[PDB]
């Protein structure tokens, strides 16, 4: 009976390793092909534009006092209930209007696979009816989101970054990330201006990786 348990474990483990190798191949060939497309446009004298980002990561920057009701409600909706809490969101028009509303109180941007992996590994906590369960094992994900074929934490990272059919379900399973304040600091002396005016909030589009890597 224990041999049967170990056999099932070994089967699922081999499945995980082939899936993860496939995902690595996918990511490397995708980025390499984008690079070669840019180079081909340059050689032909044409210009190549990359696809607009579809995922963004958002971090709360302002406390709870003296927040107006509409951004307060929007932050409730996006589960940014406290300072430095954070979530992934899929960007469409409907979400861009929300981000426009909550720009003064959040810093958001376009995240990297490295920071997504680091977040989901170090601060990755899941919801099992409730409760913010730490992940700690691929079984906890294969139970809940095996309905959607996500048998592993890396499969979950893939469904997140490659925004998939079940991004909503995976992200809602993911508890809002609890982050610290950055170790190097925020840089700027005053936070509550835009990123452009020597502040911190608003969209910065690539340095959110640096910021969340300092904060995590």
């Amino acid at each position: 009976e224990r041999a049967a348990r170990k056999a099932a474990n070994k089967e699922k483990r081999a499945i995980i390793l082939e899936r993860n190798a496939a995902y690595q191949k996918e990511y490397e060939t995708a980025e390499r092909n984008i690079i070669q497309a840019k180079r081909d446009a340059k050689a032909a004298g044409s210009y190549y534009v990359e696809a607009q980002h579809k995922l963004v990561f958002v971090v709360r920057i302002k406390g709870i006092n003296k927040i107006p009701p509409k951004p307060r409600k929007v932050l409730q909706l996006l589960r940014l209930t406290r300072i430095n809490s954070g979530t992934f969101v899929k960007v469409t028009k409907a979400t861009l209007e929300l981000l426009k509303l909550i720009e003064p109180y959040v810093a958001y941007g376009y995240p990297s696979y490295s920071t997504i992996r680091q977040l989901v590994y170090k601060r990755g906590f899941g919801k099992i009816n409730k409760q913010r369960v730490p992940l700690s094992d691929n079984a906890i994900i294969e139970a809940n989101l095996g309905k959607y074929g996500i048998l592993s934490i890396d499969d979950l990272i893939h469904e997140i970054i490659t925004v998939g059919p079940h991004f909503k379900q995976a992200n809602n399973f993911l508890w809002p990330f609890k982050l610290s304040n950055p170790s190097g600091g925020w840089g700027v002396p005053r936070k509550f201006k835009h990123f452009i005016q020597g502040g911190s909030f608003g969209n910065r589009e690539e340095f959110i990786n640096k910021l969340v890597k300092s904060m995590n």
Binding site: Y47, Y48, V49, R204
Partner: protein
């Protein structure tokens, strides 16, 4: 911060009726691509009828100086909508790069006029190839033959609190 020069191009978004629109280009001085693109749209809204939602950027690129060790005499056009209708300024800066010229220009404007980044507009930075096109006297000062000058007051930075020497500022 320490500025950089960025090439930017904008496409304003195609339609039926109008495929392949006219690709307006600009040169920007800025710390990073975000600020560069914001400034691009800021100038493009003034020049033409475009919008960040109504348009798109094609190719952000960097421009490095072709000879960043050759010393040069730059002439800069500047304007700033103050206090009257807008009025222009010509300044001359002896430096190695357009980036350094623009940085020291912004600092000099902030010092001598209390005029700010938000207030300032860069029209054209241009190297002056030939001498005798240099107009300003403070740049003419430094083009003379076999120029020499001393530094008569030397004051030495001291790492300690106390000294046993009655120090000297010589050269």
């Amino acid at each position: 911060a320490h500025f950089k020069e960025y090439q930017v191009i904008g496409r304003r978004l195609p339609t039926e009726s109008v495929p392949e629109p006219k690709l307006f280009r600009m040169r920007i001085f800025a710390s990073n691509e975000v600020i560069a693109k914001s400034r691009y749209w800021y100038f493009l809204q003034k020049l033409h009828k475009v919008k960040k939602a109504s348009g798109e950027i094609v190719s952000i690129n960097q421009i490095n100086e072709a000879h960043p060790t050759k010393v040069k005499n730059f002439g800069v056009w500047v304007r700033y909508d103050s206090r009257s209708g807008t009025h222009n300024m010509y300044k001359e800066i002896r430096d190695v790069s357009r980036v350094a010229a623009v940085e020291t220009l912004y600092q000099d404007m902030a010092a001598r006029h209390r005029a700010r980044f938000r207030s300032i507009h860069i029209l054209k930075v241009a190297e002056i190839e030939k001498t005798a096109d240099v107009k300003r006297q403070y740049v003419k000062q430094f083009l003379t033959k076999d120029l020499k000058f001393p530094l008569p007051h030397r004051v030495q930075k001291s790492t300690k609190t106390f000294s046993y020497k009655r120090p000297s500022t010589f050269y």
